[PDB]
């Protein structure tokens, strides 16, 4: 929001075209590393709407297909022959 506000102020205010192209290329880069990240890096990756869909921790491979279900329990097992096999 702030860099778009700076463009909206500086373009009708009147500033240098090289600084305008630098700030607008930073606008172009910030969207490109805000969505579909880790293509540029000028824990320091940020997460956008591609690391939440990437794999093994995202919304495809551990939050949607394999999700943590309710009504379960986990305990070690001892043998017992005297129960039937059901």
């Amino acid at each position: 929001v702030w860099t778009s506000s700076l463009i909206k102020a500086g373009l009708d205010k009147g500033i240098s075209i090289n600084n305008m192209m630098e700030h607008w290329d930073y606008l172009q880069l910030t969207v490109a590393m805000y969505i579909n990240s880790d293509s540029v890096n000028p824990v320091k990756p940020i997460r956008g709407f591609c690391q939440r869909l990437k794999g093994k921790q995202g919304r495809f491979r551990g939050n949607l297909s394999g999700k943590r279900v309710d009504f379960s329990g986990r305990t070690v097992i001892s043998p017992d022959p005297n129960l039937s096999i059901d």
């Binding site: 373009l11 009708d12 009147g14 500033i15 240098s16 075209i17 090289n18 192209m21 630098e22």
Partner: protein, 550 residues
């Protein structure tokens, strides 16, 4: 927010909204989605419309197609692939939609300039003799005149038909204009290639040049067939020394009115330039000149044969040569004195016309010759287009953007640092107007690498011209402006339908006593002033779009 900002129609379809937004106001409910599906996809067959739109079966699609056929908003094609099933394939036609754009200021512009038959209160018959031809499409005298019971006015109507068909304006045989321009060139190229097998071994030169020259001359005689004809034949068999035969169907609005309208635009150009006695002479000169002038639409290049080879320079050579050869137009002041204006150094008219006609040169308007006998235009209509664009961009914001655009065009595509030499202000307002101009896609940017790496800090910038993309952008901008204006006027129609209709039903004989309360009188007068304002702005916006058309 709250839909009053009008964004649901703003930043969407600019080109595929006007062509079927007109027929919302002209045709109706179901003769609009046919164009809305035909323009949006292009090539359609008969059953494809029925499987696309879920409005009706293949019954009422016929009604829309045979309502839009003679109105030439759609053109057909009947062909087969290899086997049979001779179905009709459909492009979309554009000239009928141009007629539905221009119709009222066709009928209201033709009278004062072109048709000089009579002026003693003949406006009661011009509308009846012209609007019924546009709104129906054809003209058969044995069925059209049969509504008129009188026979004394029949000779006057026939003389009006003769003199108005002398200057074009009605395609006489009316055949073959429902065929595509690309399909004519492809069919003639295919026919003129099938005729020569089993010969000397071919090349690109022999085959391409022979097939293209035969296709050019045959397509040229095909397009020049409906332009000049002699169907007005069998003079005085028992009466009526000059009569048009009523058998052949007769369409309307050949583009000689479009030629005349851009001629009026060029007369406005010459009027705002030097002289204005040059305007009062060159108006009467050019309205007599433009009857035989070359056509704006320019066939033989509408089909996609414009490639960067000998065909490209042949088009400019044709535009230079045919404009001098085929009109001829041996015009002098002795020819101008035959059609001489009433009281327009007031005496000694002919030598004054010599001096004014010889003084209108340098710049490119009225290119003369020692002992001149014609007048070309090849570098005058783009000058008109550029000048209209520059005064529109002067109308955009201030004179400074107009100065900046013209100086970028005139010093041949220079960088930014020397702009401050040819300017008033140093840095602030020039970046302001360059920002407000670079929001438009008219003055481009150019980036060069300094260390062979794309970085937006170490780079020097210069500004490209790119005029033609700016003309296309202004053309679609004016087209969107007309479409948005007529859509808002259609909304103004449909939100006030019933109180207009109630006064339309039976209050016609009681318009004086007004048969209503004085509140809806003010409402009807206010919405009538709104409609007058919308049409008065639409004519001007239409003319400003009409400048940008080539």
């Amino acid at each position: 927010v709250m839909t009053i900002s009008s964004l649901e129609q703003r930043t969407l379809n600019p080109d595929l909204f006007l062509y079927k937004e007109l027929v919302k106001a002209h045709l109706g409910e179901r003769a609009a989605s046919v164009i809305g599906m035909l323009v949006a996809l292009g090539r359609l067959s008969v059953r494809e419309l029925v499987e696309k739109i879920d409005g009706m079966d293949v019954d009422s699609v016929k009604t829309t197609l045979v309502s839009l056929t003679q109105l030439r908003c759609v053109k057909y094609l009947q062909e087969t692939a290899i086997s049979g099933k001779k179905t009709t394939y459909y492009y979309y036609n554009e000239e009928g939609i141009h007629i539905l754009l221009y119709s009222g200021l066709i009928i209201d512009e033709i009278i004062t300039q072109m048709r000089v038959n009579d002026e003693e209160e003949h406006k009661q018959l011009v509308a009846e003799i012209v609007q019924n031809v546009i709104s129906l499409g054809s003209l058969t005298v044995e069925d059209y005149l049969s509504s008129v019971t009188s026979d004394s006015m029949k000779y006057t109507i026939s003389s009006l038909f003769v003199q108005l068909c002398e200057m074009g304006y009605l395609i006489q045989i009316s055949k073959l204009h429902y065929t595509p321009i690309e399909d004519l060139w492809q069919f003639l190229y295919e026919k003129h290639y099938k005729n020569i097998p089993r010969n000397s071994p071919l090349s690109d030169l022999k085959k391409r040049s022979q097939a293209k020259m035969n296709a050019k001359t045959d397509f040229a005689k095909i397009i020049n067939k409906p332009n000049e004809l002699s169907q007005i034949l069998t003079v005085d068999p028992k009466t009526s020394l000059r009569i048009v035969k009523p058998t052949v169907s007769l369409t309307i609005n050949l583009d000689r009115f479009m030629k005349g309208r851009r001629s009026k635009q060029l007369i406005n150009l010459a009027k705002t330039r030097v002289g204005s006695v040059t305007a009062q002479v060159y108006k009467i000169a050019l309205r007599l000149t433009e009857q035989k002038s070359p056509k704006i639409r320019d066939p033989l290049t509408q089909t996609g044969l414009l490639q960067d080879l000998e065909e490209a320079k042949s088009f400019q050579d044709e535009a230079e040569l045919v404009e001098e050869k085929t009109p001829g137009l041996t015009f002098n002041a002795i020819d101008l004195a035959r059609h001489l204006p009433a009281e327009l150094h007031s005496a000694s008219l002919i030598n004054s016309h010599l001096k004014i006609l010889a003084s209108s040169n340098f710049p490119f308007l009225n290119e003369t010759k020692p002992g001149v006998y014609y007048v070309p235009y090849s570098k005058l209509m783009p000058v008109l287009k550029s000048s209209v664009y520059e005064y529109v961009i002067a109308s955009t914001l201030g004179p400074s953007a107009m100065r900046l655009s013209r100086c970028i065009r005139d010093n041949k595509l220079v960088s930014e640092k020397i702009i401050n030499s040819t300017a008033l202000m140093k840095e602030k307002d020039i970046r302001s107007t360059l920002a407000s101009l670079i929001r438009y896609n008219s003055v481009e940017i150019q980036e060069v690498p300094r260390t062979a790496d794309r970085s937006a800090s170490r780079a020097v910038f210069l500004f490209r011209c790119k005029e033609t993309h700016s003309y296309n952008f202004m053309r679609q901008n004016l087209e969107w402006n007309m479409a948005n204006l007529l859509f808002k006027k259609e909304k103004l129609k449909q939100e006030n339908s019933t109180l207009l209709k109630k006064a339309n039903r039976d209050d016609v004989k009681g318009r004086e006593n007004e048969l209503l309360l004085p509140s809806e009188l003010n409402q009807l007068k206010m919405v009538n002033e709104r409609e007058l304002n919308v049409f008065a702005r639409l004519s001007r916006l239409l003319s400003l779009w009409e400048v940008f058309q080539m």
